[PDB]
Design a protein around this ligand. Structure first.
Ligand SMILES: [Mg+2]
Ligand SMILES: [Mg+2]
Ligand SMILES: [Mg+2]
Ligand SMILES: [Mg+2]
Ligand SMILES: [Mg+2]
Ligand SMILES: [Mg+2]
Ligand SMILES: [Mg+2]
Ligand SMILES: [Mg+2]
Ligand SMILES: [Mg+2]
Ligand SMILES: [Mg+2]
Ligand SMILES: [Mg+2]
Ligand SMILES: [Mg+2]
Ligand SMILES: [Mg+2]
Ligand SMILES: [Mg+2]
Ligand SMILES: [Mg+2]
Ligand SMILES: [Mg+2]
Ligand SMILES: [Mg+2]
Ligand SMILES: [Mg+2]
Lengths: 45, 209, 123, 176
RNA sequence: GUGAAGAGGGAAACAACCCAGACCGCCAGCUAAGGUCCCAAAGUCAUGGUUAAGUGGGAAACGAUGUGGGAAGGCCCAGACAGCCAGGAUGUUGGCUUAGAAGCAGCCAUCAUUUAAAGAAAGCGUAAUAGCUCACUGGUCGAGUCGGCCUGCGCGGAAGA
RNA sequence: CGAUGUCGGCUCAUCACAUCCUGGGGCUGAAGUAGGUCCCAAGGGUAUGGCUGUUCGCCAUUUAAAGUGGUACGCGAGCUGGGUUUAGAACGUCGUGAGACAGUUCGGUCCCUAUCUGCCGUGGGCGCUGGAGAACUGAGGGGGGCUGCUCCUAGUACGAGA
RNA sequence: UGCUGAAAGCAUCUAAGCACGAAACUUGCCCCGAGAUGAGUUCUCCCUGACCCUUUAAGGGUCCUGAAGGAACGUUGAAGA
């Protein structure tokens, strides 16, 4: 998956693209066409 | 299981029916005799205390004697403890001979290593030597820089430096056991074990595979 | 007990006569090559019309050394000099077709079987 | 909340039992017990269970909806029960049950032996078909996925363990 | 203006910031800045709210159904939102720009009928078919649902010996 | 400025992680083998040489890899003295000249018996509540933590095949 | 990477609940280690006379006693400046 500090775009690359707040990061899931996944963050410190 | 205390006799070799020469350390194991059993109630843990050998009456202090007397066993050259594995049980004055290793394939062997005195970093820490020529002034076996500069302004604890080498406890692991013979009090293990001839050894079945 | 700069005689009809070892193969920081081990060589002398030339760079296996070989009962077999057999760089198979002087059974390494068959004496 | 506010009818035969937050639901097809989140108050009157939040807990309704859903499928468990079918795809892939162990041949050196937890039972009607049956809907799901995980479907030939209901899209290899 | 040439209190430590200008003595009292759970002198004070990030206790463009308050609006029991059942037809296998083309690439236009609606298309895909789904509408459910505005506190953005 | 010795080497290292190898994972324009790209991860490991004073770099050949950086561009009361700033000499160039160059070239003195702190070892003293001999428990601290090739599974999955 | 699962009828690995997951972490291996003044445990061994003085208190002193053990001297050591 790719990272990104912005999902405005990666959220709309596909109809099944969702956006979820797992732990405390925002993931863009898309379990049909995975290549479109992203996150906004990258862990604690 | 428990181990035994022994004496390092020396090294030799065993030749095999088909041409292999196995180098062996000869470890002497006289009966190890139990002088005290420790349990959870009285001691918080389970272990046996053993002696082996013999000691000069005139060299046995009065405390020592009261202690052996409780067990009803004769003075020994010393005392050593071995932890028990629940269900393991022994009784005061019971004798343990070396046949305990009869079917243990490898043992860890513990000893007090030969003493090399104040040793320099080349021999003690395998430091590499500086130039023997090419203008070196008085600085062939010396250690080199031992730190950085203003920052941190100190030597870090643990610095490998010169000092006492040897005369310490060393454990060698997973030696093949080549022969056991109680009739002669012998245990042969493959390879070298720590220490000089004469010194006491601890043999324990090997904790690893 | 071969290293960089070591010179070796040659136990075959490859045309080489003197080679220098320029790399001991088989591990980072590896110090010494021995019987059976592969080294990299440059050719320092060759005959006029052989399979290789002065300055050629290849691989070769050591088959005799002065440090010798230990056998499992403690014996030692030592030779009066250090020799190798040149091997094509990629196939690591012998260039030459004949082998000279005794070799050792340490060679029963599959790939170098051809060397023991060709070898006069085997120790 | 739309889910919390929806009562679950407990049919003739199912026995509800409540002790604070600890629910127990016994039926013709087993007995499951679950502990509901503190913030959930559950009530049992008529032949129905109804759910609602509890004063002082900021998220009772979300909790209550979770609670509702769970019990709905607990009751289904000890009545109708749940079935997850997986199937193997690929040459040499086979499976079989002996007692409570599913034996998976999945192109590895060692075959795979998969133990099963209590409540899940297995049957292969075919060397290439695994039917799990069980009352804990979570447990059949964990198991069904554990088995699927030994060899996830691959995208070029669909080979592997898949949920029978599953959509596996294949793709073409990289042109040369 | 302060240091310089100014002590005392605060700002952990810190000439130059805040409070404040030390003739001397006191085991009295009110204050200032700044403080009142412990180290550590004074509220574990009352009261009404936010925040769940130890944010508080480092940092931007930008990101997001985090959550608080406010004022409007659109749709909706002539049944909305989501979900699920349906269909998604005919001029027309679309003429035609390039070697296919049947919306199937690019430029041009973007007409038309049967209807409950159905785009000379929405984009996956492509030998042509394609065989997917949707845009849009009929059914089912049954009461809410949508996303802009003013604003509070927070989230991510955030790696160094 | 009543003195903090400069480049490079050698010895010796210690840290960050913006990771070179090895470990784990997402995507891939990933068939496989092998790659690309990101995420996690700092445990350990992480080239010898030809040339030049070099660091670097080019080359040769290895390797799993030959990591990027902090550390007075770490480390001269630890060593070197090859580069670079004394004095000698020359070339080129500049100047009428003395001399000059931040251009080249040949030669050209590197101290310090460790008080304190720090560190490596090693004893003395007193304590731990009458003294003494042992054997222990284990709060805590340290060390260790690298990887190659080949065999099988298997010439199997995969692949038109190779 | 997943199960179950709501807020949000759907979806959703997470909000409650739950399965996995790496040389990093805690252990497991070796060494030191009760000055661990938080000075721990166990076993054994040894000491069973009076008197004076003052500021009468865990006071000072005298006589007689002198253990267990520790050291000392000596012969030494694959232990060691
Ligand atoms: Mg997580
Ligand atoms: Mg010695
Ligand atoms: Mg000198
Ligand atoms: Mg010298
Ligand atoms: Mg210095
Ligand atoms: Mg300091
Ligand atoms: Mg102050
Ligand atoms: Mg005044
Ligand atoms: Mg106070
Ligand atoms: Mg609807
Ligand atoms: Mg000075
Ligand atoms: Mg990182
Ligand atoms: Mg590996
Ligand atoms: Mg060199
Ligand atoms: Mg040369
Ligand atoms: Mg420097
Ligand atoms: Mg010097
Ligand atoms: Mg403990």
């Amino acid at each position: 998956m790719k990272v990104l500090n912005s999902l405005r775009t990666a959220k709309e690359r596909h109809p099944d693209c969702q956006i979820v707040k797992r732990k405390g990061r925002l993931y863009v899931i898309c379990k049909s066409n995975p290549r479109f996944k992203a996150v906004q963050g990258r862990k604690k410190k | 299981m428990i181990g035994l205390v022994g004496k390092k006799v020396g090294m030799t070799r065993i030749f095999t029916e088909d041409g292999v020469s196995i180098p062996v350390t000869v470890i002497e194991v006289e009966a190890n005799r139990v002088t005290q059993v420790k349990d959870l109630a009285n001691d918080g843990y389970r272990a046996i205390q053993v002696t082996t050998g013999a000691k000069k009456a005139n060299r046995v202090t009065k405390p020592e004697a009261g202690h052996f007397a409780k067990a009803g066993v004769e003075a020994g050259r010393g005392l050593w403890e071995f932890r028990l594995a629940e269900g393991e049980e022994f009784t005061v004055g019971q004798s343990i001979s070396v046949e305990l290793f009869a079917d243990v394939k490898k043992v860890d062997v513990t000893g007090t290593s030969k003493g090399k005195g104040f040793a320099g970093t080349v021999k003690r820490w395998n430091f590499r030597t500086q130039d023997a020529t090419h203008g070196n002034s008085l600085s062939h076996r010396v250690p080199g820089s031992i730190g950085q500069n203003q920052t941190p302004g100190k030597v870090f604890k643990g610095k490998k430096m010169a000092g006492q080498m040897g005369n310490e406890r060393v454990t060698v692991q997973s030696l093949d056991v080549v022969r056991v013979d109680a009739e002669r009090n012998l245990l042969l293990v493959k390879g070298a074990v720590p220490g000089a001839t004469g010194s006491d050894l601890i043999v324990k079945p090997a904790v690893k595979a | 007990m071969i290293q960089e700069q070591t010179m070796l005689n040659v136990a075959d009809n490859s045309g080489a006569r003197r080679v220098m070892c320029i790399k001991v193969l088989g591990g980072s920081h590896r110090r010494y090559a021995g019987v059976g081990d592969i080294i990299k060589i440059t050719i320092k002398e060759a005959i006029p019309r052989g399979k290789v030339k002065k300055g050629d760079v290849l691989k070769a296996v050591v088959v005799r050394t002065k440090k010798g070989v230990r056998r499992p009962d403690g014996s030692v077999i030592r030779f009066d000099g250090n020799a190798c057999v040149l091997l094509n760089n990629n196939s690591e198979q012998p260039i030459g077709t004949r082998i000279f002087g005794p070799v050792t059974r340490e060679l029963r390494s599959e790939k170098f079987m051809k060397i023991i068959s060709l070898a006069p004496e085997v120790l | 909340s739309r889910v919390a506010k929806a009562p679950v009818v407990v049919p003739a035969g199912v026995d509800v039992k409540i002790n604070g937050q600890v629910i127990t639901i016994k039926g013709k097809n087993g007995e499951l017990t679950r502990t509901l989140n503190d913030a959930v108050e559950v009530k049992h009157a008529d032949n129905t269970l109804t759910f609602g939040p509890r004063d002082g807990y900021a998220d009772g309704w979300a909790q209550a909806g979770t609670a509702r859903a769970l019990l709905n499928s607990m009751v289904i468990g000890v009545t109708e029960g749940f079935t997850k079918k997986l199937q193997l795809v690929g040459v040499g892939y086979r499976a079989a049950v002996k007692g409570n162990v599913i034996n998976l041949s999945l192109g590895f050196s060692h075959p795979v032996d998969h133990q099963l937890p209590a409540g899940i039972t297995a049957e292969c009607p075919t060397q290439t078909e695994i039917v799990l049956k069980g009352a804990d809907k979570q447990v059949i799901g964990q198991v069904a996925a554990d088995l699927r995980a030994y060899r996830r479907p691959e995208p070029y030939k669909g080979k592997g363990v898949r949920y029978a209901d599953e959509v596996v899209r294949t793709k073409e290899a990289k042109k040369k």
